[PDB]
Design an enzyme around this catalytic site. Structure first.
Site, PDB file in Angstrom:
ATOM      1  N   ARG A  58      13.776 -17.617 -52.081  1.00  0.00           N
ATOM      2  CA  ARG A  58      13.386 -18.083 -49.906  1.00  0.00           C
ATOM      3  C   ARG A  58      14.596 -18.714 -49.282  1.00  0.00           C
ATOM      4  O   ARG A  58      14.811 -18.731 -47.854  1.00  0.00           O
ATOM      5  CB  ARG A  58      12.215 -18.673 -49.631  1.00  0.00           C
ATOM      6  CG  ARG A  58      12.727 -20.292 -49.879  1.00  0.00           C
ATOM      7  CD  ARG A  58      11.170 -21.206 -50.075  1.00  0.00           C
ATOM      8  NE  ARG A  58      11.460 -22.593 -49.938  1.00  0.00           N
ATOM      9  CZ  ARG A  58      10.927 -23.339 -49.886  1.00  0.00           C
ATOM     10  NH1 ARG A  58      10.262 -23.558 -49.189  1.00  0.00           N
ATOM     11  NH2 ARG A  58      11.556 -24.919 -50.590  1.00  0.00           N
ATOM     12  N   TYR A 460      10.342 -40.451 -58.390  1.00  0.00           N
ATOM     13  CA  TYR A 460      11.892 -40.143 -58.442  1.00  0.00           C
ATOM     14  C   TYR A 460      12.305 -38.711 -58.488  1.00  0.00           C
ATOM     15  O   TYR A 460      13.092 -39.192 -58.788  1.00  0.00           O
ATOM     16  CB  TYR A 460      10.897 -40.472 -60.241  1.00  0.00           C
ATOM     17  CG  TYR A 460      12.491 -41.348 -60.824  1.00  0.00           C
ATOM     18  CD1 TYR A 460      13.557 -40.192 -61.607  1.00  0.00           C
ATOM     19  CD2 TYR A 460      13.138 -42.078 -61.488  1.00  0.00           C
ATOM     20  CE1 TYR A 460      14.878 -40.941 -61.950  1.00  0.00           C
ATOM     21  CE2 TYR A 460      13.440 -42.859 -62.056  1.00  0.00           C
ATOM     22  CZ  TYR A 460      14.588 -42.101 -62.286  1.00  0.00           C
ATOM     23  OH  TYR A 460      16.023 -42.559 -62.835  1.00  0.00           O
ATOM     24  N   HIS A 462      11.468 -35.836 -60.070  1.00  0.00           N
ATOM     25  CA  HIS A 462      10.385 -35.654 -61.162  1.00  0.00           C
ATOM     26  C   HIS A 462       9.862 -34.907 -61.166  1.00  0.00           C
ATOM     27  O   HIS A 462       8.996 -35.244 -62.353  1.00  0.00           O
ATOM     28  CB  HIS A 462      11.326 -35.946 -62.583  1.00  0.00           C
ATOM     29  CG  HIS A 462      12.793 -36.725 -62.041  1.00  0.00           C
ATOM     30  ND1 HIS A 462      13.214 -37.050 -63.032  1.00  0.00           N
ATOM     31  CD2 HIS A 462      14.364 -36.510 -61.023  1.00  0.00           C
ATOM     32  CE1 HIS A 462      14.657 -37.962 -63.212  1.00  0.00           C
ATOM     33  NE2 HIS A 462      14.973 -36.759 -61.778  1.00  0.00           N
ATOM     34  N   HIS A 500      15.318 -37.025 -67.569  1.00  0.00           N
ATOM     35  CA  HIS A 500      16.358 -36.434 -66.510  1.00  0.00           C
ATOM     36  C   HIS A 500      16.140 -34.390 -67.216  1.00  0.00           C
ATOM     37  O   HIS A 500      16.891 -34.013 -67.386  1.00  0.00           O
ATOM     38  CB  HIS A 500      18.021 -36.946 -66.659  1.00  0.00           C
ATOM     39  CG  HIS A 500      17.779 -37.773 -65.616  1.00  0.00           C
ATOM     40  ND1 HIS A 500      17.672 -39.188 -66.500  1.00  0.00           N
ATOM     41  CD2 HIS A 500      17.962 -38.337 -63.929  1.00  0.00           C
ATOM     42  CE1 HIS A 500      17.592 -39.750 -65.500  1.00  0.00           C
ATOM     43  NE2 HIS A 500      18.154 -39.746 -64.199  1.00  0.00           N
ATOM     44  N   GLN A 502      16.811 -31.474 -65.451  1.00  0.00           N
ATOM     45  CA  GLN A 502      16.956 -30.420 -65.255  1.00  0.00           C
ATOM     46  C   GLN A 502      17.676 -29.703 -66.417  1.00  0.00           C
ATOM     47  O   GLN A 502      17.473 -28.331 -66.583  1.00  0.00           O
ATOM     48  CB  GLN A 502      17.903 -30.870 -64.220  1.00  0.00           C
ATOM     49  CG  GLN A 502      19.650 -31.319 -64.781  1.00  0.00           C
ATOM     50  CD  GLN A 502      20.775 -30.989 -63.480  1.00  0.00           C
ATOM     51  OE1 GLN A 502      20.614 -30.014 -62.991  1.00  0.00           O
ATOM     52  NE2 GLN A 502      21.788 -31.946 -63.922  1.00  0.00           N
TER      53      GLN A 502
END
Ligand SMILES: Cc1cc2nc3c(=O)[nH]c(=O)nc-3n(C[C@H](O)[C@H](O)[C@H](O)COP(=O)(O)OP(=O)(O)OC[C@H]3O[C@@H](n4cnc5c(N)ncnc54)[C@H](O)[C@@H]3O)c2cc1C
Ligand SMILES: *[C@@H]1O[C@H](CO)[C@@H](O[C@@H]2O[C@H](CO)[C@@H](O)[C@H](O)[C@H]2NC(C)=O)[C@H](O)[C@H]1NC(C)=O
Ligand SMILES: *[C@@H]1O[C@H](CO)[C@@H](O)[C@H](O)[C@H]1NC(C)=O
Ligand SMILES: *[C@@H]1O[C@H](CO)[C@@H](O)[C@H](O)[C@H]1NC(C)=O
Ligand SMILES: *[C@@H]1O[C@H](CO)[C@@H](O)[C@H](O)[C@H]1NC(C)=O
Ligand SMILES: *[C@@H]1O[C@H](CO)[C@@H](O)[C@H](O)[C@H]1NC(C)=O
Ligand SMILES: *[C@@H]1O[C@H](CO)[C@@H](O)[C@H](O)[C@H]1NC(C)=O
Length: 521
Positions: A58, A460, A462, A500, A502
């Protein structure tokens, strides 16, 4: 051996990126991936090794917003006003906590704080999924070869690391990508020249003859087979930046995969009639597949923090040094002052502004055990953000863990490592100058720490859940009850893989792509 080097952001993939206004992108594909983000980009690149893939995003391309491409630009993108086209989309949870999500090719890896870690090795058996653990590790290495470096020394990160160790966050793990108890230097997706590397660069590993990417493509509905006896996803409707509609389909044994994030994936499923039967019926949305859990079990790990204002300037840094325990994950960012706040760094817009350099010292609650939901605001318009509530600290275990983390931050402020950053050379931690609320007075007053935790919580960033494996999906990430439809992104798990995530979700995109290909062979 395999880590990436310092290098320019690789935009070679733009040769197969097109505006969604181009109607020649319409037609039949082997796979359609919805959301060109953290999982979506490596998923699409992986599938394109063999099959024809359409990736729909998008947002626009990151070259349109140059401050997404450097470590120094991190704050800028959050400071920038949200005009509906920017890479950072602002929102406020129903709890009242400011937050952001990405709106750009590359997803949240284009706007995030760059910290790279592999999942806690216990996560795989915790899920019960029959993971191919050798393939998981080969896939981490594929990501890391492309976009992860060993960070160079930064003075503030080294101070904080010495403090974590002195405060008892042991052992010293040196440089390590792994989520393990103790203090370590982890990897970064900012290289040592400050260039941001991100999930969009994994598109360069796709086959340029098989992969097409449409940007400014707002996917508003998943299309299904009219024969429901054998209910299958068959394609999507998406609109372009001028508002016109377009349709694309999968063919044969191909599949639609939703990779639109914790917020975007449940929103699109609900809009498409996949979700809780009485809820959808109450909106007069025709139910394609009833499932009570779509948009349920949505989680946001709490961030709690203090800010110190040293009497001498400290150097700004990106986060690279982590202090990990089972009940809290801790880091610190050092920052220049600002007169425009980076939105959601603090939980509301009425937060005091720093006039000198400051250290943001942070603790993350694991899990969390508290959960809420994503529900629709508009029953038709995918560009209207859904309602999201996280119910911070509704589960008492989360609050107890925040209390423990805050007490450990008190230990950290009492280290020799942090002593040079006090404004007054007195014995107590009131010798620091604080931006905002300081840690409560007496560690014996758990009620004062509980109040601090509850009143000063932030996101956070996340957040995860809403299309969980075991509730909406099977162990192969297929939407239960629907053929040719999968979900791969952070909506899929109810707990964090690590501090974390990712790195896990980058890996997951390729990993599930490989599982799809293997299944088909
Ligand atoms: C400010 C911030 C900093 C962070 N820092 C770190 C960090 O340092 N380290 C770390 O490990 N994690 C970090 N995270 C968390 C981590 O980056 C995310 O959890 C992860 O990137 C989410 O990946 P995803 O694939 O689920 O979503 P995304 O990467 O957001 O991908 C979803 C994509 O789908 C697109 N999309 C959504 N709806 C539609 C639709 N209808 N049609 C088409 N496209 C659509 C979105 O535009 C987006 O590009 C951070 C998060 C934030 C918000
Ligand atoms: C890594 O993940 C595992 C699995 O979730 C965590 O193990 C839990 O650890 C706590 C504290 O030791 C125990 O109370 C739980 O019973 C454990 N659960 C399981 C299933 O073993 C572990 O804490 C995580 N490690 C880190 C450093 O975060
Ligand atoms: C797509 O084309 C429209 C004009 O039709 C333009 O306004 C928009 O900026 C273009 N988007 C991209 C990503 O090129
Ligand atoms: C995968 O890599 C981790 C380190 O991240 C290592 O501890 C583990 O033994 C590896 N597993 C396999 C199956 O090779
Ligand atoms: C749904 O449609 C019925 C008519 O079929 C109407 O009575 C009801 O008010 C509608 N509800 C909503 C939320 O649109
Ligand atoms: C807190 O979460 C745990 C894990 O889901 C659960 O067992 C417990 O009942 C929860 N507490 C409350 C009050 O819901
Ligand atoms: C839509 O969102 C706004 C602001 O987030 C909220 O005030 C409003 O109640 C929501 N409307 C619906 C119908 O959910």
């Amino acid at each position: 051996h395999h880590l990436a080097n310092t290098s320019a952001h690789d935009f070679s993939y733009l040769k197969f990126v097109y505006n969604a206004t181009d109607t020649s992108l319409e037609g039949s594909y082997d796979y359609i991936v919805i959301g060109g983000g953290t999982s979506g980009c490596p998923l699409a690149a992986t599938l394109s090794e063999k099959y024809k893939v359409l990736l729909l995003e998008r947002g626009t391309i990151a070259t349109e917003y140059p401050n997404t491409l450097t470590a120094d630009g991190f704050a800028y993108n959050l400071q920038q006003q949200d005009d509906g086209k920017t890479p950072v989309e602002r929102f406020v949870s129903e709890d009242g906590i400011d937050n952001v999500r990405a709106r750009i090719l590359g997803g949240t890896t284009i706007i995030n704080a760059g910290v790279y870690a592999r999942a806690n090795i216990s996560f795989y058996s915790q899920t019960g999924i029959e993971w191919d653990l050798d393939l998981v590790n080969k896939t981490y290495e594929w990501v890391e070869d492309a976009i992860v470096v060993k960070p160079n020394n930064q003075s503030w990160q080294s101070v904080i690391g010495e403090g974590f160790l002195e405060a008892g966050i042991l052992p010293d793990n040196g440089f390590s990508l792994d989520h393990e108890a103790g203090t370590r230097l982890t990897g970064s997706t900012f290289d040592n020249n400050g260039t941001r590397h991100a999930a969009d660069e994994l598109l360069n590993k796709g086959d340029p003859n098989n992969l097409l990417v449409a940007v400014q493509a707002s996917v508003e509905k998943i299309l299904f087979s009219s024969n429901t006896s054998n209910l299958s996803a068959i394609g999507v409707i998406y609109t372009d930046s001028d508002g016109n509609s377009h349709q694309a389909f999968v063919r044969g044994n191909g599949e639609v995969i939703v990779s639109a994030g914790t917020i975007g994936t449940p929103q699109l499923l609900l809009l498409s009639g996949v979700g809780p039967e009485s809820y959808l019926s109450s909106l007069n949305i025709t139910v394609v597949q009833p499932n009570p859990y779509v948009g349920q079990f949505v989680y946001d790990n709490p961030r709690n923090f203090i800010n110190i204002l040293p009497p001498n300037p400290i150097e700004a840094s990106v986060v690279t040094v982590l202090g990990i325990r089972s009940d809290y994950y801790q880091v610190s960012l050092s920052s220049l002052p600002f007169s425009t706040p980076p939105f959601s760094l603090f939980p509301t817009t009425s937060y005091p502004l720093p006039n000198s350099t400051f250290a943001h010292i942070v603790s993350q609650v694991p899990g969390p055990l508290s959960h809420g939901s994503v529900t629709l605001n508009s029953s038709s318009d995918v560009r209207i953000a859904p309602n999201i509530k996280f119910n911070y600290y509704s589960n008492s275990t989360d609050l107890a863990n925040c209390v423990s983390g805050m007490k450990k931050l008190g230990d950290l402020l009492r280290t020799k490592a942090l002593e040079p950053y006090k404004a007054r050379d007195v014995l107590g931690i009131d010798g620091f100058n604080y931006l905002g609320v300081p840690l409560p007075e007496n560690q014996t007053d758990d009620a004062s720490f509980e109040t601090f935790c509850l009143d000063n919580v932030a996101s956070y960033w996340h957040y995860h859940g809403g299309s969980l494996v075991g509730k909406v999906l099977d162990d192969s990430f297929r939407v239960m009850g629907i053929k040719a439809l999968r979900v791969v992104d952070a909506s899929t798990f109810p707990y964090e893989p690590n501090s974390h995530p990712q790195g896990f979700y980058l890996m997951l995109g390729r990993y599930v792509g490989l599982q799809i290909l293997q299944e088909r062979s």
